[PDB]
Ligand binder design. Structure first.
Ligand SMILES: Cn1nnnc1NC(=O)c1cccc2c1n(C)c(=O)n2Cc1ccccc1Cl
Ligand SMILES: Cn1nnnc1NC(=O)c1cccc2c1n(C)c(=O)n2Cc1ccccc1Cl
Ligand SMILES: [Co+2]
Ligand SMILES: [Co+2]
Lengths: 381, 381
């Protein structure tokens, strides 16, 4: 069921902002590893004395990387005279975030009809305010509320190119890399307590429950009216024979935070060929592949959806496949993006639910816990 | 003149350690941009609960990238029970360094005969102690004294593979990149006051003055007995019509620190072809090239050393050339390595002074201040 209970008009995921120690090095690593183009900047060269911010894009996917400069560069500024392009930025908050959590997502940004009304309605319905609505160059409004941990949900609304004060990048520095990634599919948080987390976020957004599951974890998915904004949340389950990976996350992250970003590809085969070619030359590593028993069992499970050759290509690339009563999901997971065993990336492509494709088509891979464990037991034999 | 006045036996540059917020992303960016192989690690996977450290190598050049984990992972440890592989590492010192200076060099490490005697003699001769001599696995001794700012001079001595507690990297994660870089030629500091800086370092090392110059700066070079360890130091000169780039460094770095690392290549043409191919896909950018008038004037200055075709290749790659009474220097400079206009890299190759090649052959490029400014005036006409 979809009660379509959003308390304000939500459009799509807009961008993800990482808080970094050095934005330059993280942005360049991510650009090469994911095939994203350097598309906009706000830094000393654009008159920003406060923070360095670099925007990468692939299709509709937008990753922003931000780090603070020395506060001495802007010591005489006040908020009414700031040279920062992102008004919510604060030197101390950014340094405290990075010192506590390491590299990670500070902001999950969604485009809304009206960021001022989204903020006001959210706070009226229980959201903890983080940054009030600010109008930039009479063209864009930005506001932020607490999502979980030190992650904020950022609302952006446009009157009528990323943000005022950002400059488009010189084409020489903008190499047109593209490995097929096209948009953010879902963004997943880890929290100590799922119930309170869900009650809080669904309380101020009106997002409805899309899915739920139970492994070492319990999860549920919150969704916007058209189910294009998807926010799953996990909690650890204690008492299992193996330690919860959610609990390991919370320990190494110093608490709740964003666990993974799932990035939709228009051609997951091409994306994984390109990413795997670069794993050991500056890119991203992938989790160990399933045993060949997993791919033998795939023919029995999705042989009507994928040809034998298409299943062989999944096997070559380490791609996992799960299936709904409605759709089929192709997915694979990276190793952690940085030093700590915390945030990682998922690459996904969905088959089915054509109407445009409906959001969440095929689910989130819950069937691959059992199928993988079973295939692992079969391979040892 | 070379009085050969070293107060202890010094061998060669051993490694450079960067203090980072996220060692993984900086190391991967540097590996791809410079053509350095991932060769050793000390991190959670090797039992280090304190810091993540990744070693890149190209020839004899060793770059180490280190970042702290959450202190909560090691809260019960004490120094006698530490799982850190580098005993001088301290969570607070590392976070304070990175918060203050951003990405930069913490340690300039030289291999010595006996790190305990090097430390004791240094401190007896005025060096400020930073970390006392510690014997690792009865095999390696490491000690540190203050060099300038928050940069330390690190002594390493070996009884008889980087450091105990580091593990060699699995060959799949070790891609054999190589763009021709082979060793560290010199490491340059910026300080507010050259005289006191020189008196201090030469006082505790016995290093002698190799060279001196005067642009916006004054510089002098300290050198070991065989002039293979070369430590230039710059100070700003105020009153010039253009603001001293040394002063800009000090402002953005929050004080003294390491300005550039000059990396010797066995084939600077190949190194620059390879680095420039990668500038916009995760690598390093280079400073704007000299006008064609600079390369027309090169024929008059080094036409007996470099053929016309070799000068054309310098022109294609933006390479600068200077000449001594003894040798010829090919050099080029990167843009800053990170967000701040502070640390950068120089690629160099030296021609002449064959005996092996003598250290510092051809100088450090002082002639290229005048030659470049003159060529710039000639091009406008
Ligand atoms: C709840 N939720 N909502 N949106 N996304 C999510 N969770 C995930 O994507 C997700 C995150 C981590 C592990 C997963 C996930 N899934 C769906 C699985 O099947 N595994 C098992 C698995 C995967 C790859 C290699 C070995 C194994 Cl053992
Ligand atoms: C003192 N010292 N000791 N060891 N190294 C050093 N200094 C340097 O390498 C050095 C560092 C920054 C600028 C320099 C340097 N040199 C030698 C030059 O000629 N310029 C002028 C120049 C270079 C490239 C593009 C335009 C220009 Cl304008
Ligand atoms: Co997922
Ligand atoms: Co130099």
């Amino acid at each position: 069921k979809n009660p379509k209970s959003d308390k304000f008009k939500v459009k799509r995921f807009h961008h993800i902002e990482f808080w970094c120690g050095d934005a330059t090095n993280v942005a360049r690593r991510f650009s090469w590893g994911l095939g994203m183009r350097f598309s906009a900047k706000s830094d000393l060269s654009t008159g920003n004395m406060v923070h360095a911010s670099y925007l990468l894009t692939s299709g509709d996917l937008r990753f922003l990387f931000t780090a603070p400069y020395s506060p001495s560069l802007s010591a005489g500024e006040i908020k009414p005279t700031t040279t920062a392009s992102i008004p919510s930025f604060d030197h101390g908050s950014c340094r405290s975030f990075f010192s506590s959590h390491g590299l990670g997502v500070r902001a999950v940004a969604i485009e809304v009809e009206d960021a001022e009304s989204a903020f006001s309605i959210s706070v009226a319905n229980g959201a903890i305010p983080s940054s009030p609505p600010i109008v930039l160059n009479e063209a864009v409004t930005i506001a932020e509320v607490k999502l979980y941990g030190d992650v904020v949900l950022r609302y952006v609304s446009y009157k009528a190119e990323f943000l005022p004060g950002f400059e488009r990048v010189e084409d020489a520095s903008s190499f047109p890399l593209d490995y097929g990634i096209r948009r953010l599919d879902h963004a997943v948080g880890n929290v100590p307590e799922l119930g309170p987390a869900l009650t809080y976020v669904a309380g101020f957004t009106g997002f409805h429950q899309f899915a739920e599951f139970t492994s070492g974890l319990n999860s549920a998915v919150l969704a916007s009216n058209d189910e294009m904004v998807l926010l799953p949340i996990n909690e650890p389950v204690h008492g299992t024979k193996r330690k919860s990976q959610i609990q390991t996350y919370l320990e190494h992250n110093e608490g709740a935070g964003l666990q993974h970003l799932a990035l939709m590809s228009e051609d997951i085969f091409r994306t994984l060929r390109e990413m795997r070619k670069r794993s050991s030359i500056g890119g991203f590593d992938f989790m160990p592949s399933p045993p060949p028993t997993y791919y033998q069992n795939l023919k029995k499970r999705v042989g009507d959806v994928l040809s034998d050759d298409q299943i062989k290509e999944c096997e070559e690339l380490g791609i996992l496949v799960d299936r709904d009563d409605q759709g089929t999901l192709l997915q694979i997971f990276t190793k952690p993006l940085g030093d700590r065993p915390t945030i990682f990336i998922e690459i996904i492509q969905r088959v089915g639910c054509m109407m445009y494709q409906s959001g969440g088509c095929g689910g989130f891979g819950k069937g691959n816990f059992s199928e993988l464990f079973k295939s692992i037991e079969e391979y040892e034999k």
